[model samples]
Target: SANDNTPTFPEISYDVYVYTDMSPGDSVIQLTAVDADEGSNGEISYEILVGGKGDFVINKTTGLVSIAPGVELIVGQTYALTVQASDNAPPAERRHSICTVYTEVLPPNNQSPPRFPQLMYSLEVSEAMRIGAILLNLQATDREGDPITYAIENGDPQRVFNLSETTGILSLGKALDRESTDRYILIVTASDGRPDGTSTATVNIVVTDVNDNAPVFDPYLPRNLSVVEEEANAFVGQVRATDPDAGINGQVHYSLGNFNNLFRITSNGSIYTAVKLNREARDHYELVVVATDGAVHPRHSTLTLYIKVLDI
Candidate 1:
């Protein structure tokens, strides 16, 4: 028959405290055990089970325990443990408790910014972004897990900005002003999981400029373009100047350089013989031609020309 009148074994329980959100460098772990009986062996100690092996160790006399030095804990890894304690006074009674601890790895560090698949792109000043206008072919990955999403948090509102949902391709969402706004700073937020576990990445966009200026004549008149004989006028092909400004600023008109009637400017930047240069006449003149935008902010320019006569 069993010993029915014998006293029951002491009930035992254990507690393991694990720190979540651990970085790749170093980590800490702590554990303790509690028993109802009171004796020299009542003091609890720890031991790793199955596979934890030499990674974790326990103190024989004190319940205070910790993992061995140089041992690393991985994210999402579940660890099981046991704390054993016993009384040496009478009946040689023993007790133990089981527990499990979970480890949470920190998000990967984002020391460097994100980058587009291509280093450069071609865009038109007047055209909006379309399939061919912008390329969305870039993404990011973590060494730990998946579920990486792309997000745009900041940048110029008028310069246009957008990102692909599935592909992570960053492109323009609106029309761009290459001459006015040349650069853009993009903020991309990436999320792995666990709503709060998110990181940020930056990108730099440079808008390229093109040549849109038109050719024009400098002066408003053709007097300075000295021409005494018809032969001198024939040698001077055409009086022309150029505008460095692009767009509407490129359009220009030519006019009379000198009212002396010795020279005239056509609307096409050409200087013609509007009057006569008498013989044996020391003829020399100066003139100016002007270009006007006729807008609220009218823009203009002037040109100077020289002329002379020679006989063979």
Candidate 2:
């Protein structure tokens, strides 16, 4: 092929057999060094530049190199070595080689089993009212440094307790009736967010009782019972109902039942004529009365009694 039109290849170039796998029992390898020149201008021997970290030994006849091992290489660490091959040409040749290394990781350790908090809590509401409130200052603590938080799992807003997530404050948002709900139930949970952790705490908020309902009037006494008008400045006696709740809850008020004017109510539960009664102006008048409270918890009564204005 003296036609050799392909720019006649260079006289000196080589291939490298780079070694890897630092573990023991790994074998050595031969790097084939090729040359384009013929006759005495051929590759003679190979030499290795031992990188400071590891050892390198080459067989003089085979160009087979061995990487000696000692310490374990980290998973991402890389080792580099340089090798030179000399061909008896006008000039010598050399190459720097690089190799990658790898290894496995260690495992985790634990002393004891993780603990889980029990799920059990209760909430309640008392008798009927337009608006009511309940306070839930519930608290829970953990032993193994696991953080805990509280939440309302299930319950009724119209008839049960309303709560705050950060602070355990529960409030009654609606009226409650004993006829319908004798007792209200609720579920609460404490959670610890960890890979192998748990939560274990419970709370119960009970609704206490307060007097509020009032007594109603008897049917035997008609709503409009009247009396004869007197000729002088007459003091027509009236009636009132005592409130159900006592002390602060037992405060009372009064109003006219059938008659609008001519009568009034007192702080003590007594009634007197607001205007003088005349025999000609009108014969008699009827009145209605009620009671109430100012305490945060209020109660009412159902008793209603009628009174007839008499002549003075």
Candidate 3:
């Protein structure tokens, strides 16, 4: 007297293509029930008996069909379940069977483009580090939360780096002379307005060295040098300063501003006659020339020298 079997499903309906970032109970598919009739009328169990909005979970005894503990799947959503399979007859003569599971929430077949977990990004900047100063704070990643938007798409040259299209912060739009540009390959951009979702990063600006520079000498007024006072220790004339700042802040030392005095300077700035230039005791002589720069907070530039009383 065994005849209470009814639980069969080899597909009365089933599509299942989940992936809206899947990972809740993971097992978007695995349902198959078949009851033949035996002791308790062939045991088999699985249920979801209707779920159109999505909050599914069917695996009473391994008919698996998850995605319910917090159910989050929305991308062209389409969940429409109604899977019920039971057969352990008795208890009101149970023997149900029904099938239909759609599930499809797929939409992520390769749309990622805003990713830069640092393959290259560095900033040891210090060319005195000023002028709006920020430096670097550009980080990106869009596992599908896509909202990024920053720019500076090319090794900033005259633009001087000032990117922050929406909080990517990379300021300092000028005044950084590590002798006029010292490493700044910045090419950062992480826009997810999609057109391929753009992405690029390679910020490596290292501009360090500070003395602020000031040992320069040009024809901007005040200059003179001559030597012909019967030449006793004479060969004056050699002063050309330049200090861009690097290595002891651009070593260039020379000082001579009348040591009372007769005039003497040489640290390769040549100017002679430290006494003994009798143009009859003095025909015309005045001296003052300094160009010092070997930093520790040192920077100087001054010029003026003359000596003319010739008659031999």
Candidate 4:
């Protein structure tokens, strides 16, 4: 009877909207078609013909469409699904209608927080670099394409560095002194203007040493020393100095400013007479002591010593 008549083809329309944030098994949109034949030929069932490979499902008995379980949607992306509605007539006489449904993913205003490429960054800078020198460039990106801002939140107690608000560029705010500080741990932040759209990254900055600070002698000045006349290899006073710099800048060298054959100074700050002293010929002798650092620029300090010869 009803199976004897061929089912009329169904008709459908396009255009459907679905939320990206919708939960799995949530309804997308219903696809419906009408058949003009009698009995079972007029009853309709729905199925997914194409598209939505792992994303959607359609009920055959009730033309209800829903997202597939365990499927996730990406915001700002659109998915095209084709659905078919067929009449419940005999296989040979069944009729179907195909329609395209477009589901567009929506944004929740702000999608995600700003993210950096790495958790931490390391930078090495010379202490001789001047203010406003660029140390490094920090980078971050927003998944939703939101504008990002950068700032130095902490780790520079002396305020020796600054960061660009829009470009994420880190620059020196003041001159670097390796004697004061050689290492800095900085916390950099990136924000996308949302309440939860902020991220932090750590930066390790190392300040390299430069030759500076001349060697200085403590209690330096004219001092008197006595040695027995005709004494051979007599001991004399010591010259001590210090340099407040690092590496070769702090390495000290001693030299005799006044050239003489009777006296000599050692590199270990010891002064001695090379030969026997004659008090009758010369009662007193003036010796100049110079302390210099072994840096490329070679900074130095000078002092004088008075040696008195006594009769033995």
Q: In the order shown, what is each candidate's alpha-carbon RMSD? A: 11.7, 17.7, 11.1, 5.0
Q: Give the lDDT of residue 55 in candidate 1.
A: 53
Better of 1 and 3 by TM-score: 3
Worst lDDT window (10 residues) for model 3? 218-227
- How well does candidate 1 score on lDDT at residue 232? 29
lDDT for predicted candidate 3 compared with the true structure = 0.76
Give the number of the best model, judged by lDDT.
Answer: 4
| Model 1 misplacement above 4 A | 1-60, 67-132, 141-149, 174-177, 191-195, 209-212, 215-224, 227-312
lDDT of 3 by residue, 73-128 (tens): 77666777988888876767777879988766765663657777886887788877
Candidate 1 RMSD to the correct structure: 11.7
Determine the C-alpha RMSD for candidate 4 after optimal superposition of all C-alphas: 5.0
Give the higher-lDDT candidate: 2 or 3.
3
Q: Estimate each model's TM-score.
A: 0.41, 0.31, 0.42, 0.68
Model 3 residue 229 CA deviation (Å) reads 18
Q: Considering lDDT, which of the candidate structures 1 and 4 is the better prediction for this target?
A: 4
Better of 1 and 3 by lDDT: 3
Which one is best on TM-score?
4
lDDT of each: 0.50, 0.46, 0.76, 0.80
CA lDDT of 201 in candidate 3? 75
lDDT of 4 at 202: 96
**Per-candidate count of clashing residue pairs (backbone under 3 Å):** 26, 20, 0, 0
